[PDB]
Design a protein around this ligand. Structure first.
Ligand SMILES: Nc1nc2c(c(CN[C@H]3C=C[C@H](O)[C@@H]3O)cn2[C@@H]2O[C@H](COP(=O)(O)O)[C@@H](O)[C@H]2O)c(=O)[nH]1
Ligand SMILES: [N+]
Length: 321
């Protein structure tokens, strides 16, 4: 069933986990409510996402998801675009569209391979500064050179080699692009997540409306994308519970080291939180794919009540690259 081993490896963490557990009573109740009013994920957002030709849109999706991480910090990083102030993901998406409309060639492997610290400090210019600026530059350079060297500057070539398999395409991405390699260990066992590689596949589906390069026959094989907003929504809905030390650490906005048992438990329990909710919805005759349940919860996250427990703060590491 699980050809990437996200569900298999995360399942071992959820079974042994000390600081996080699922409230299956709360899963049942949220499923009852969601299935009753037949909730849908939002439509892949056309306004803040770029669109273009086949070849350029494919490379744009790769660039977008290559740097799709870690937006928290003080002072909050914000962007002005089309007379609106944005933060977090929508800041990332706006900053890229803004740069593209002013004809910065971010879709071009040659430009990316070469891109300087100051080129990307400009693209993400606003209140404060995007976290891990230097790292995003390194990742975009890595993305360009791999595109240029292995795929003739066209992500379309990678996508064609996947033969409409979402799972095949994740594996091709992690194999070729080092910075998409999202694995950890728990009590000496490897745990596999592949957040940005899996987001990338769902974003192609969204961008191309499940046609051409966005066509995939096995989207059901995707899991949830183990980020920091979705577990915040599952804690808010009562589905994820946190033990005392972790509850206090999140409340005080203390940072959690990447790959620490607490961070890996939050992420593994996010994967199974979304999975057990998908099962319970299906049981109640509302059959969604795990990525759709993710999109739907991520959307809830964009309008949580002020004074819900803060999201966990992990500074994303690329030590090995
Ligand atoms: N699990 C999951 N995580 C997601 C997304 C998205 C954007 N996807 C779009 C495509 C289809 C959907 O309907 C969305 O419109 C961003 N993130 C993560 O969020 C965090 C920033 O959060 P804030 O500060 O609140 O913007 C950061 O870790 C980023 O990686 C998602 O879909 N699922
Ligand atoms: N969110």
């Amino acid at each position: 069933g699980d050809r990437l081993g996200v569900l298999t490896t995360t399942r071992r963490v959820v079974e042994q986990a000390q600081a996080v557990w699922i409230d299956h009573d709360a899963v049942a109740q949220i499923a009852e409510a969601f299935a009753a009013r037949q909730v849908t994920p939002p439509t892949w957002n056309r306004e803040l996402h770029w669109s273009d030709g086949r070849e350029a849109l494919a490379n744009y999706i790769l660039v977008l998801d290559a740097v799709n991480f870690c937006f928290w910090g003080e002072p909050r990083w914000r962007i002005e675009y089309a007379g609106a102030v944005y933060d977090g993901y929508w800041a990332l998406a706006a900053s890229l569209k803004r740069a593209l409309e002013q004809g910065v060639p971010l879709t071009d492997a040659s430009y990316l391979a070469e891109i300087t610290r100051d080129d990307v400090a400009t693209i993400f210019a606003g209140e404060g500064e995007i976290p891990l600026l230097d790292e995003r530059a390194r990742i975009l350079r890595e993305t360009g050179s791999v595109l240029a060297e292995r795929f003739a500057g066209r992500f379309s070539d990678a996508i064609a080699a996947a033969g409409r398999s979402a799972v095949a395409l994740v594996d091709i991405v992690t194999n070729a692009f080092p910075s998409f390699r999202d694995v950890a260990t728990y009590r000496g066992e490897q745990v596999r997540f592949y957040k940005r590689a899996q987001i990338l596949v769902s974003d192609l589906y969204g961008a191309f409306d499940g046609s051409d390069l966005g066509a995939f026959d096995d989207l059901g094989e995707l899991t949830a994308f183990a980020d920091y907003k979705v577990p915040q929504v599952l804690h808010h809905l009562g589905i994820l519970r946190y033990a005392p030390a972790l509850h206090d650490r999140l409340a005080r906005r203390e940072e959690i080291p990447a790959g620490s048992p607490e961070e890996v438990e939050i992420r593994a329990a996010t994967i199974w939180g979304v999975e057990e909710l998908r099962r319970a919805l299906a049981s109640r005759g509302h059959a969604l794919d795990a990525y759709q349940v993710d999109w739907l919860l991520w959307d809830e996250g964009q309008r949580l009540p002020a004074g819900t427990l803060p999201y966990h703060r992990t500074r994303t590491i690329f030590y090995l690259e």
